[PDB]
Amino acid sequence: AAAQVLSSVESEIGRTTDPVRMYMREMGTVELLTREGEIDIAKRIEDGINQVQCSVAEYPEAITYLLEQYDRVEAEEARLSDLITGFVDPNAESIDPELAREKFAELRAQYVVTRDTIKAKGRSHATAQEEILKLSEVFKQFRLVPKQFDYLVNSMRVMMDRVRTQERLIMKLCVEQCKMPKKNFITLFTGNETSDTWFNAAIAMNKPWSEKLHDVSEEVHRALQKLQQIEEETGLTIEQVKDINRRMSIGEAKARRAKKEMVEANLRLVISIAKKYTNRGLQFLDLIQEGNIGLMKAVDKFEYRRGYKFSTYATWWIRQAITRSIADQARTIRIPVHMIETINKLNRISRQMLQEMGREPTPEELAERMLMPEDKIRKVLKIAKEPISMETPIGDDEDSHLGDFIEDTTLELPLDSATTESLRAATHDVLAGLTAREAKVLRMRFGIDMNTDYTLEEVGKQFDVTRERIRQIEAKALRKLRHPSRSEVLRSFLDD
Amino acid sequence: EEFDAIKIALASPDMIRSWSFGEVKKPETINYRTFKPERDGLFCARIFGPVKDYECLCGKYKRLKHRGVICEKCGVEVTQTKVRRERMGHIELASPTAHIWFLKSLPSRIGLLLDMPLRDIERVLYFESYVVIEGGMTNLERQQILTEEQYLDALEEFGDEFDAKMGAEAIQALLKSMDLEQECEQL
Amino acid sequence: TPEEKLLRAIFGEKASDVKDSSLRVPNGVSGTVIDVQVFTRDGVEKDKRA
Amino acid sequence: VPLDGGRFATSDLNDLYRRVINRNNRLKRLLDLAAPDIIVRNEKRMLQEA
């Protein structure tokens, strides 16, 4: 009952642009699997996680980097930061150095007993393979905290992307130059994996189309030198690395498929919670998206070993997500979650106060019942107000809106501008009428028609080292400016 | 300054980026305690300039003489208030968007240039059905609509050559891959 | 502005930073006050005026 | 700007830009976390509507 529903909806929609109906159609195709689907999805997710853990255990460079980071964080002998919480911290199927050493002793022993058995007849020896299998079985019982697990996964992804980029660059430099078949190239590259003996065999072969090879022979080895350096830095076989990468990719694909199936199955629960929480807020679409994000964050941390129902956990996570979204978003100004909770508590108290008394809750009684000062209550009542729209009509008639009803008190007015212009013109005229050096010192001290306002020592170092003479000149200029015959025109600016 | 004519044309993305002097990421307008804009808000003082007349955000840069000095704490260029009047911002989007008024306005110039009715491009943009951008095989060609079931039926058969995207990306790829001179000659 | 600073240094007045936002009578209105009404909250005292 | 009645006067265009920015941030968070196909389509439709 999937194709017929889609066909009927597409034939019935008369160019309707309702996102709610589109979302309901997209989520209505997947049905529910009660008590039998979620368990299988969780089992497949755990199987994928175990496959990823096995692929990591078969990749000893990750364990080497982990041990190096542990040695770096322990070399200071005093470190109890948040980095310890992101370590392995295995579970028994708070933190203390004793148990850490007790659990890492056998790990270090296995590491040092496996590192010595690498040169034993090669990397594919029977004893070496058994030791690697034992190390992997031991590592499988260690659950990694996602804090550093995400960093390790990102590092492995970066390494795999670099390897694939080098391989693609080599393939391009081969194809775009010599037009070589992929079947005769990838096969030899996988079979040899050591040197350029396949290149010598291709040269020995006739290949009439491969005569144009001397112009790219100098670049083939230069490009393969990067792969040789990568192999020397890693020190592992190419076949095992490719197998680990393929297994990790398959596991990640299965995990993503299981997560998508769980999300498509719980979309109906998400929309049911949205209907149970039908508040206008910002919009129903934003609330549905927040619920979906919460559902994904819950699935990324959910397990079926608790023996309970995923419905309650998903509901709690969706409620938390919606609360955070309505506290942060769905408002003009940003209000913190703590302030929102305090406002909600004050409203719940005022609801009972009005039900018991019948009058608006006074701030004094509210502060006495809340055991808080009246200043906080007053500030909350002042700030908690929804901003008024800009297109609200001032009167009953919808003729003139609130577009032009506010005065511009930010910029100045022509009155003060003309007053300041007349004042500066009068001061300039007075300075021009006075002595030259006096006006120069007054302009360099206060900043009339000058950018920088020099101090006493600056004006001194510019004009005369004696700072007392500059002070005397400034005082004489001020005393001459305070003369009534010359201040009769400046007394009018006493108010300004 | 005296302009001769008034030209109207389509705006370029890089030109819109050059018009702005910063990107707006957080939708915060103001704080409930202080009316100072957030350092990444809508009308932030770093992107659109100072609020007051030649005054920084933290009120440290007095002495108006200091002009064009970027602060190390708030980072507000000390200029006049009218700077905010003649400047705009930009928003970096993740997925491209189709201009609504370019196809909703009659006579649906997008549908005229693409030779496709309005209902089809509406179903494509609103993610109701998929469209083939360019088909190398002899099965389908450009401007072919496939539903959800048809897309899955056609995707399991072939691969690595069936080019199809969703709405805005598909339309952008079609507009980029199309040639105007060949279509004009054909018409 | 430096001009106002020089003027204040010349006159030497205090000129305290106090705004003047008092209520004035609109222009062209010459009448008589019947009765005034002072409304305050419970926290602020009547201040010997109300 | 704050109104004379001690309250704030917002603009509808500010709210529209806030909605657009919120939807863009949600789309970025969904793309960075590998959101499912249905959720990505719904978020893109919401961004187009915004």
XYZ file of C-alpha atoms in Angstrom, chain B:
187
model
C 28.062 61.481 -8.885
C 25.479 62.596 -11.450
C 24.128 59.410 -13.033
C 23.069 59.325 -16.678
C 20.783 56.275 -16.830
C 19.226 53.641 -14.568
C 20.206 50.066 -15.439
C 18.461 46.923 -14.191
C 19.925 43.430 -14.540
C 20.489 40.190 -12.644
C 22.799 40.242 -9.628
C 25.852 37.973 -9.393
C 26.651 35.947 -6.249
C 30.258 37.150 -6.021
C 29.052 40.719 -6.571
C 26.529 40.324 -3.745
C 29.342 39.030 -1.528
C 31.512 42.013 -2.488
C 28.638 44.379 -1.662
C 28.595 43.126 1.934
C 31.342 43.462 4.549
C 30.580 40.432 6.707
C 28.366 37.375 7.040
C 25.430 37.102 9.445
C 25.292 33.729 11.204
C 23.432 34.077 14.491
C 19.883 35.509 14.600
C 20.436 37.238 17.959
C 19.254 40.853 17.963
C 20.007 42.204 21.456
C 20.490 41.125 25.070
C 17.816 41.517 27.728
C 20.285 43.361 29.994
C 22.291 45.532 27.575
C 21.087 46.803 24.192
C 24.461 46.084 22.583
C 24.225 43.904 19.445
C 25.811 40.463 19.531
C 29.161 40.048 17.780
C 27.467 37.732 15.236
C 23.897 39.064 15.198
C 21.694 40.666 12.574
C 22.764 44.309 13.037
C 26.130 43.550 14.662
C 28.444 46.530 15.078
C 31.388 44.728 13.451
C 29.598 44.031 10.158
C 27.485 47.173 9.704
C 29.542 49.705 11.667
C 28.992 51.629 14.891
C 25.601 52.371 16.401
C 26.273 55.761 18.004
C 28.057 58.735 16.410
C 31.730 57.684 16.248
C 31.661 55.329 19.226
C 32.697 51.692 19.563
C 30.650 48.880 21.101
C 32.331 48.723 24.522
C 32.541 52.527 24.729
C 36.341 52.451 24.849
C 37.126 54.282 21.584
C 36.347 57.874 22.511
C 38.296 60.798 21.023
C 36.594 60.758 17.592
C 39.996 61.540 16.013
C 40.500 57.753 15.933
C 38.889 56.927 12.575
C 39.157 53.539 10.898
C 40.815 51.817 13.867
C 39.593 48.238 14.301
C 39.343 47.351 17.981
C 40.929 44.218 19.419
C 38.132 43.537 21.938
C 34.905 44.429 20.102
C 36.223 45.189 16.612
C 34.093 48.176 15.589
C 35.267 50.622 12.921
C 34.802 54.123 14.346
C 32.740 55.923 11.689
C 29.494 57.888 11.478
C 25.986 56.512 11.966
C 24.914 57.025 8.336
C 27.316 54.238 7.315
C 24.675 51.686 8.332
C 22.259 53.359 5.903
C 24.315 52.677 2.749
C 25.561 49.143 3.458
C 24.062 45.654 3.482
C 24.952 42.116 4.529
C 24.803 38.598 3.153
C 23.864 35.097 4.313
C 25.783 31.976 3.286
C 23.241 29.261 2.492
C 23.983 25.536 2.418
C 21.633 24.491 -0.403
C 20.775 26.667 -3.426
C 17.260 28.079 -3.681
C 15.093 28.807 -6.704
C 13.869 32.388 -6.968
C 10.111 32.269 -6.398
C 9.239 35.423 -8.347
C 11.239 34.225 -11.373
C 8.765 31.398 -12.087
C 5.599 32.492 -10.250
C 5.448 35.786 -12.156
C 3.654 35.549 -15.486
C 4.369 34.460 -18.116
C 6.653 32.083 -16.158
C 9.861 33.098 -17.908
C 11.675 30.100 -16.401
C 9.175 27.758 -18.037
C 9.483 29.681 -21.298
C 13.281 29.403 -21.365
C 13.120 25.734 -20.326
C 10.059 24.860 -22.475
C 8.144 23.340 -19.568
C 4.769 24.171 -17.973
C 4.499 25.733 -14.535
C 3.000 22.624 -12.917
C 6.053 20.528 -13.812
C 8.621 22.959 -12.404
C 6.424 23.373 -9.318
C 6.355 19.606 -8.756
C 10.127 19.508 -9.292
C 10.976 22.397 -6.956
C 8.664 21.259 -4.137
C 10.387 17.829 -4.142
C 7.345 15.958 -5.458
C 9.039 14.323 -8.461
C 12.561 14.001 -9.834
C 13.780 15.338 -13.191
C 16.549 14.062 -15.467
C 19.267 16.673 -15.982
C 21.073 15.047 -18.921
C 20.798 11.457 -20.110
C 23.733 9.995 -22.006
C 21.890 6.789 -22.879
C 19.112 6.480 -25.459
C 16.494 5.741 -22.778
C 15.670 9.265 -21.573
C 16.803 12.783 -22.439
C 16.696 16.210 -20.802
C 13.430 17.480 -19.292
C 12.045 14.074 -18.287
C 10.005 13.712 -15.089
C 10.068 10.532 -12.994
C 8.073 9.821 -9.839
C 9.409 8.165 -6.681
C 8.695 4.641 -7.944
C 9.899 5.346 -11.491
C 13.169 6.798 -10.181
C 13.815 3.686 -8.085
C 12.925 1.430 -11.022
C 15.303 3.311 -13.334
C 18.121 3.565 -10.772
C 18.403 -0.176 -10.094
C 18.919 -0.943 -13.795
C 21.676 1.474 -14.861
C 24.219 3.526 -12.944
C 27.019 6.104 -13.070
C 25.325 7.803 -16.062
C 21.758 8.691 -14.960
C 22.052 12.330 -13.875
C 19.150 13.452 -11.686
C 18.951 15.877 -8.765
C 16.220 17.434 -6.604
C 14.691 20.777 -7.546
C 17.080 23.711 -7.303
C 20.265 21.701 -7.882
C 18.783 19.956 -10.928
C 17.556 23.253 -12.389
C 20.956 24.872 -11.806
C 22.750 21.958 -13.479
C 20.329 22.144 -16.415
C 20.879 25.893 -16.803
C 24.648 25.360 -16.624
C 24.792 22.478 -19.123
C 22.419 24.027 -21.676
C 23.713 25.990 -24.669
C 21.916 29.114 -25.869
C 23.320 29.341 -29.408
C 22.339 25.782 -30.353
C 18.790 26.247 -29.051
C 18.483 29.573 -30.886
C 19.650 27.963 -34.135
C 17.212 25.072 -33.660
C 14.328 27.481 -33.042
